[PDB]
Amino acid sequence: SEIHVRISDFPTIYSLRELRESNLSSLVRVTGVVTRRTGVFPQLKYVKFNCLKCGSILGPFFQDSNEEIRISFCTNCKSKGPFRVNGEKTVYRNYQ
Amino acid sequence: VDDVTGEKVREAFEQFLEDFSVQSTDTGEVEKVYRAQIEFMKIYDLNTIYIDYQHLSMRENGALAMAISEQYYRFLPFLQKGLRRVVRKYAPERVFQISFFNLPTVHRIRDIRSEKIGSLLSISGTVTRTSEVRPELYKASFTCDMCRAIVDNVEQSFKYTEPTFCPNPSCENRAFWTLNVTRSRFLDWQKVRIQENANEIPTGSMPRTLDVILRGDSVERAKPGDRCKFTGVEIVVPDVTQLGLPGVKPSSTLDTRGISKTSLGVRDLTYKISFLACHVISIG
Amino acid sequence: VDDVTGEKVREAFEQFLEDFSVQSTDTGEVEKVYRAQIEFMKIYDLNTIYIDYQHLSMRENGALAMAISEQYYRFLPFLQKGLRRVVRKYAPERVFQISFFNLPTVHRIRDIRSEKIGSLLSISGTVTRTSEVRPELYKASFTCDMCRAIVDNVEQSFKYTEPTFCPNPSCENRAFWTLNVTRSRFLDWQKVRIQENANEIPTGSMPRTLDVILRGDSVERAKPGDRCKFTGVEIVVPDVTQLGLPGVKPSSTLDTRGISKTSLGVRDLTYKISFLACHVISIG
Numbered sequence: 001s002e003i004h005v006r007i008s009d010f011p012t013i014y015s016l017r018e019l020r021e022s023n024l025s026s027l028v029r030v031t032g033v034v035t036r037r038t039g040v041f042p043q044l045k046y047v048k049f050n051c052l053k054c055g056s057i058l059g060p061f062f063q064d065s066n067e068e069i070r071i072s073f074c075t076n077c078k079s080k081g082p083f084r085v086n087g088e089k090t091v092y093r094n095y096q
Numbered sequence: 097v098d099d100v101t102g103e104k105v106r107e108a109f110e111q112f113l114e115d116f117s118v119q120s121t122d123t124g125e126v127e128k129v130y131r132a133q134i135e136f137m138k139i140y141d142l143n144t145i146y147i148d149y150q151h152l153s154m155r156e157n158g159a160l161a162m163a164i165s166e167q168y169y170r171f172l173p174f175l176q177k178g179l180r181r182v183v184r185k186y187a188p189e190r191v192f193q194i195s196f197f198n199l200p201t202v203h204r205i206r207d208i209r210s211e212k213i214g215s216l217l218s219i220s221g222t223v224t225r226t227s228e229v230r231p232e233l234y235k236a237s238f239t240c241d242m243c244r245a246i247v248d249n250v251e252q253s254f255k256y257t258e259p260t261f262c263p264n265p266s267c268e269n270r271a272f273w274t275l276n277v278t279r280s281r282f283l284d285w286q287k288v289r290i291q292e293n294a295n296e297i298p299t300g301s302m303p304r305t306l307d308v309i310l311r312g313d314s315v316e317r318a319k320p321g322d323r324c325k326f327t328g329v330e331i332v333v334p335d336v337t338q339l340g341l342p343g344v345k346p347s348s349t350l351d352t353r354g355i356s357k358t359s360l361g362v363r364d365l366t367y368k369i370s371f372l373a374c375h376v377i378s379i380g
Numbered sequence: 381v382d383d384v385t386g387e388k389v390r391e392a393f394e395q396f397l398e399d400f401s402v403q404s405t406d407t408g409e410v411e412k413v414y415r416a417q418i419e420f421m422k423i424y425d426l427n428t429i430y431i432d433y434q435h436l437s438m439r440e441n442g443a444l445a446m447a448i449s450e451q452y453y454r455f456l457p458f459l460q461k462g463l464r465r466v467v468r469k470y471a472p473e474r475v476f477q478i479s480f481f482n483l484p485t486v487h488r489i490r491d492i493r494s495e496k497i498g499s500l501l502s503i504s505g506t507v508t509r510t511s512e513v514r515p516e517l518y519k520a521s522f523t524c525d526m527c528r529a530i531v532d533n534v535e536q537s538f539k540y541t542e543p544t545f546c547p548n549p550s551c552e553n554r555a556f557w558t559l560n561v562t563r564s565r566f567l568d569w570q571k572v573r574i575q576e577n578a579n580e581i582p583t584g585s586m587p588r589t590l591d592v593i594l595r596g597d598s599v600e601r602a603k604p605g606d607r608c609k610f611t612g613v614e615i616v617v618p619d620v621t622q623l624g625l626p627g628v629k630p631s632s633t634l635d636t637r638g639i640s641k642t643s644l645g646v647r648d649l650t651y652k653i654s655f656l657a658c659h660v661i662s663i664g
Contacts, residue, residue, distance in 0.1 A: 017513070017600070019513060021565075021566040025562070055358060056356055072268075078269070
């Protein structure tokens with residue numbers, strides 16, 4: 001139910017060393033040489049919490065880019081702001 | 097169905113008054129009495145109507161007369177909203193009150209049951225212990241410290257429930273805040289408690305009392321020591337003191353067999369019969 | 381006085397470049413070289429200037445040349461702001477960098493003292509261990525959760541002090557929040573650490589090192605293994621590790637003999653000599 005796409009032919013190639021402030025939040029066509037890397041790690045995609053005060057789970061939420069969710073207080077008369085991510089029912093995404 | 101039917105009630109009533117008004121000839125009034133009703137109100141701008149029940153009993157052969165007279169509480173916004181479009185068709189801030197008169201049937205306090213709620217029944221009696229003039233809000237401007245604190249919104253009904261769940265501020269459904277006490281449209285009202293007539297009381301029985309509120313235009317029309325006729329409509333106020341009455345007490349313990357889990361904020365209810373009116377004539 | 385004098389420095393320098401540029405005849409260049417400087421920059425739009433020190437030594441007989449060369453750190457905004465009005469007089473987003481060349485006097489690391497700060501002195505040496513390209517913010521958009529979160533504001537200087545005290549939001553002076561990471565104007569820079577020449581080292585002494593940052597246009601002009609000449613200007617970076625040096629350590633214990641009362645958030649300082657430049661030629 002979700003397809004992320006690829007872009008083929010961006011007709012200007014900056015190899016390296018030419019990055020400026022005018023290059024952030026933009027698409028750059030980059031070449032280079034594969035250096036070392038790490039293993040493959042899991043990262044959250046759908047996040048569920050469970051309110052330990054008011055019984056059962058909170059619900060699914062979306063993985064924002066480079067930021068946490070931190071739902072404050074709801075379904076407990078919107079109070080008692082303690083929460084935690086549950087282990088199960090959280091669909092992840094592989095990271096590297 | 098019911099979205100259509102009350103709207104069919106709305107359009108047929110919109111059809112009704114926009115037709116001819118009175119059958120009578122040039123000897124008397126000819127036509128367009130309800131059309132002259134707004135046009136004479138356009139002269140004075142008091143923003144209410146005096147419409148007859150008897151002319152409504154003429155056209156649909158009581159089929160529509162026996163449509164309104166049972167569940168009027170169902171029929172608050174439909175009677176108001178269509179008439180609002182009748183006004184802007186003919187006339188140019190505008191707030192409305194709908195008044196009835198000429199009820200064929202008048203009963204007493206003893207002829208009132210809980211099956212009579214929502215319906216129209218006329219009650220006369222003895223006015224005692226009038227009270228002052230006090231406002232009523234019905235227009236909450238209440239939203240949280242998040243940016244959109246401009247929610248002109250709910251609690252027009254008989255509940256102090258200001259905040260709606262789904263705004264599109266940063267505020268959530270649990271986020272609620274106080275009402276803006278400067279940007280709303282109010283109305284005033286008084287609260288008299290009518291006593292029952294002495295010409296109808298049976299043996300062994302004292303006369304009885306009942307509270308009634310006159311809102312908006314019908315304030316100050318009351319008079320302690322007077323006989324009056326009322327609007328047929330009727331409401332129910334929640335009570336408190338009827339505890340250890342005794343009786344099987346209803347409760348509001350919600351369902352827990354829905355969402356799976358890994359406290360008890362439940363409530364009860366015990367109300368009382370009240371009365372509401374908009375037209376009071378003082379004949380008697 | 382000093383509001384006038386640096387503005388008198390601003391206007392006389394505004395007088396200077398807007399005058400004739402070069403004395404030379406039709407054999408050679410005639411006039412308006414600094415006027416052609418912007419007009420040729422108008423062709424390419426690289427938004428900097430190459431102005432001479434020697435022509436500035438001609439007109440005021442060194443009275444103005446001995447006004448700038450001592451406290452340049454005092455004279456950052458005045459040299460920039462008047463030139464900005466020179467541009468809009470002649471030309472139309474605009475950001476500026478001021479470059480000098482032709483310093484008559486060049487010294488070494490050993491000829492640098494703390495009395496030489498703010499002044500202009502040229503140092504040559506041996507470039508070693510260049511580093512990458514990294515940005516610099518100098519334009520904070522940082523204000524609290526109160527409505528006016530749009531404060532394009534301070535920490536242009538060498539301090540991470542985003543929030544100004546007096547806004548006219550609901551936010552107070554103690555209210556501070558993060559910078560908006562999308563609406564600012566940045567610049568990039570690299571950081572090389574120059575070593576001293578071997579043709580100047582005395583007996584018993586090793587060559588010495590010094591850090592220097594080239595901001596904006598002067599990035600990538602550096603070359604490890606090269607002899608270069610610098611901008612005269614100089615700055616001072618706060619240090620940390622000079623503790624138990626030993627020495628009498630300065631502190632910032634503020635006054636308590638002011639406001640009457642009915643804890644100790646005081647600090648110290650221990651800095652180090654750094655260097656800053658904007659023009660690097662690579663002769664040698």
